[PDB]
Enzyme design. Structure first.
Site, short mmCIF file in Angstrom:
data_model
loop_
_atom_site.label_atom_id
_atom_site.label_comp_id
_atom_site.label_asym_id
_atom_site.label_seq_id
_atom_site.Cartn_x
_atom_site.Cartn_y
_atom_site.Cartn_z
N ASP A 9 55.23 60.51 30.28
CA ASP A 9 53.95 61.03 30.77
C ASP A 9 53.28 61.84 29.67
OD1 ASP A 9 55.28 61.80 34.05
OD2 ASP A 9 54.27 59.99 33.33
N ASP A 11 50.35 64.55 30.26
CA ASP A 11 50.23 65.91 30.78
C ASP A 11 51.55 66.47 31.30
OD1 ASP A 11 46.85 65.57 32.18
OD2 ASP A 11 47.58 65.82 30.14
N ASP A 177 57.39 64.43 34.79
CA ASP A 177 57.31 65.81 35.24
C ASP A 177 56.84 65.96 36.68
OD1 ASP A 177 54.01 67.13 34.47
OD2 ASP A 177 54.61 65.08 34.94
#
Lengths: 231, 230
Positions: A9, A11, A177
């Protein structure tokens, strides 16, 4: 089997909390690429954002954007869905909730409606979807609301991205995340969650890094390279 | 006195291969920390510029499509629309079947981007003149940009300055190419990186010793120092 690529990912994973690139993650990615392990960036942001990120960071794997709805590789964009019912949904929201707003990036997207979670809750969105009877799902990442087709997700996006690379999805190691990373975890061969990830993701990961955010992403990449004999 | 710094992306804060240069990245973040907004300038799409601003960490407006698109605080403003550009392209495809446009065309609204690998800029200009279209074709060395004659980095920076609430003459620009002369004209301080063409260097207030990203970093620190921010 063996791991031949790392999906990760953008961000909260290779960035600081404010979304700017984290130098440790940047360096880990560049080292991984130099070891012959392509990095596939994954994001809920636009495919244009993902492409820019690949160019600036230096990743060579396909990018998976719009939460799996868009894929770009070697300047070729492929969208796994198109929009229609999303416009029916938004028009209803417009008339009934005049303060509700969509992301300024909507002109760039083709596989998902992005709604500003601060202007309307996801519960209200789902109610309307049920009312007008639409084949859509609304997911709140805690940062924005994404409305898309039921079959569109990071997992299906990564499976398609894996095809362009010429590898099996099970030969991919994913670093995430958030909760929606569970979709990616489902299709890949190895699963890593950074420290600030939700309990639900950690429980399903093969490894949870000690650090969060960017440092965590770097740690995750090193863990994968070391565990699978690349470093 | 300088209140903001405008700077190109490619060739100025990147390596020749377009990857972000860590030294330029550190310099940009230092300038921002010191209270000096950085305005990214590029011939690339407004989406690319916005992404660069988020990833690099800049707070000033971004000037994209070579001055034809500006974005600030999630608000995009296009200073042109395409019409004659498509008429031109239609004629080009008829005469030169191998000519191609950039894959990013779906993202753009203020300039046709033609792949320089597939057709000469001279040829494009010849067709523009034959059809008597009010367009100009510029070769950045990376791609051919066909746009309205009044669209440029300078006019883009002036508009960006307006959004930032400052005067163009309170901006310091860092460039690497011929097309940066337009920017030099409207700003208050001018810097050229080492690999820039002679024409740009001769009009710069300062020419960095280093090229590309290292030059961009040097440029930023020279500006921060000269105007008492360090």
């Amino acid at each position: 089997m063996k791991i031949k690529a790392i999906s990760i990912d953008i961000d909260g994973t290779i960035t600081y909390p404010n979304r700017m690139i984290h130098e440790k993650a940047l360096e880990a990615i560049r080292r991984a690429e130099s070891l012959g392990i392509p990095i596939m960036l994954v994001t809920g942001n636009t495919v244009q954002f993902a492409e820019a990120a690949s160019i600036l960071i230096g990743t060579s794997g396909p990018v998976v954007a719009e939460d799996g709805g868009a894929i770009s590789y070697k300047k070729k964009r492929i969208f796994l869905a198109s929009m229609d019912e999303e416009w029916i949904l938004w028009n209803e929201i417009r008339k009934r909730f005049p303060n509700a707003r969509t992301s300024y990036t909507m002109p760039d997207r083709r596989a998902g409606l992005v709604i500003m979670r601060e202007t309307i809750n996801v519960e209200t969105v789902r109610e309307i979807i049920n009312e007008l009877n639409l084949n859509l799902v609304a997911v709140d990442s805690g940062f924005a609301i994404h409305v898309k087709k039921p079959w569109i997700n990071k997992g299906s996006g990564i499976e398609k991205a894996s095809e362009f690379l010429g590898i099996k999805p099970k030969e991919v190691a994913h670093v995430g995340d958030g909760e929606n990373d569970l979709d990616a975890f489902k299709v890949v061969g190895y699963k890593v969650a950074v420290a600030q990830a939700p309990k639900i993701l950690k429980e399903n990961a093969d490894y949870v890094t000690k650090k969060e955010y960017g440092e965590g992403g770097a740690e995750a990449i090193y863990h994968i390279l070391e565990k699978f004999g690349y470093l």
